[PDB]
Design a protein around this ligand. Structure first.
Ligand SMILES: OC[C@H]1O[C@@H](O[C@H]2[C@H](O)[C@@H](O)[C@H](O[C@H]3[C@H](O)[C@@H](O)[C@H](O)O[C@@H]3CO)O[C@@H]2CO)[C@H](O)[C@@H](O)[C@@H]1O
Length: 226
């Protein structure tokens, strides 16, 4: 494995199919992750965060294009209306301390260039586990059954539409989770336009306080075009 401690450190993994990012985007507090280069599995070995109500970081693994940095042959960005299947698998190891979540972060925008972000697009999160009383942004607008489980639907109308699906009960793993079901629900709600592009599928841990001991493993994402 390799240890990453730099704020914006990254490593291509799984033959370039995915990329792992330390991503300490909202704080100066220290954080390191130990990464398996073949699998992309990583454990947060250190996290001095104590950021109050604002996220300190989001160590993650992703498929696609994150702020212009794309993985190898992901087939993304690709219009939502041109998607027929989007699947993902992940196994997370939770901890009993700190304030954090274990969640997917999926980015959409009207344009194909993601170098400057996703303004005017959407961010769809899928929260699988958490600790410390953290809550999604915005307000809960519904509770819906999708892809084999039940989810609270949280929405915030920011520079981009924020949609977070929070499982009614925590879990530590998903296998071939139907991401397209979530995208379809968000489109139905008017939060994502079919003409918009899916840029990236990411998962990891949003950290507010602490986080050492959390582990991400068995990541996979596949996308099938129509
Ligand atoms: O490294 C490239 C660019 O990163 C920008 O930071 C973003 C992070 O990369 C991204 O993971 C994070 O996503 C947040 C999202 O903002 C929030 O709404 C959601 O609830 O949680 C996600 C996970 O924490 O967003 C930030 C900021 O948009 C840097 O801002 C940029 O300078 C840098 O080039």
């Amino acid at each position: 494995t390799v240890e990453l401690c730099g704020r914006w450190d990254a490593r291509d993994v799984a033959g370039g199919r995915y990329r792992v990012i330390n991503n300490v985007w909202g704080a100066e507090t220290a954080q390191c992750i130990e990464v398996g280069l073949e699998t992309g599995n990583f454990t947060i070995t250190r996290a001095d965060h104590d950021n109050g109500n604002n996220v300190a970081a989001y160590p993650a693994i992703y498929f696609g294009c994150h702020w212009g940095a794309c993985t190898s042959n992901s087939g993304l960005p690709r219009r939502v209306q041109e998607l027929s299947d989007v699947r993902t698998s992940w196994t997370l190891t939770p901890i009993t301390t700190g304030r954090w979540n274990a969640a997917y972060d999926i980015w959409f925008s009207p344009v194909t260039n993601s170098g400057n972000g996703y303004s005017g697009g959407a961010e769809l999160m899928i929260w699988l586990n958490w600790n410390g009383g953290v809550m999604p942004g915005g307000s809960r607008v519904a509770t819906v059954e999708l892809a084999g489980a039940t989810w609270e639907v949280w929405y915030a109308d920011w520079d981009w539409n924020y949609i977070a699906y929070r499982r009614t009960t925590p879990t530590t793993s998903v296998s071939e989770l139907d991401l397209k079901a979530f995208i379809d629900d968000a489109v139905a709600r008017g939060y994502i336009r079919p003409e918009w592009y899916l840029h990236a599928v990411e998962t990891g841990f949003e950290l507010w306080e602490g986080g050492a001991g959390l582990r991400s493993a068995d990541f996979s994402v596949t996308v099938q075009k129509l």
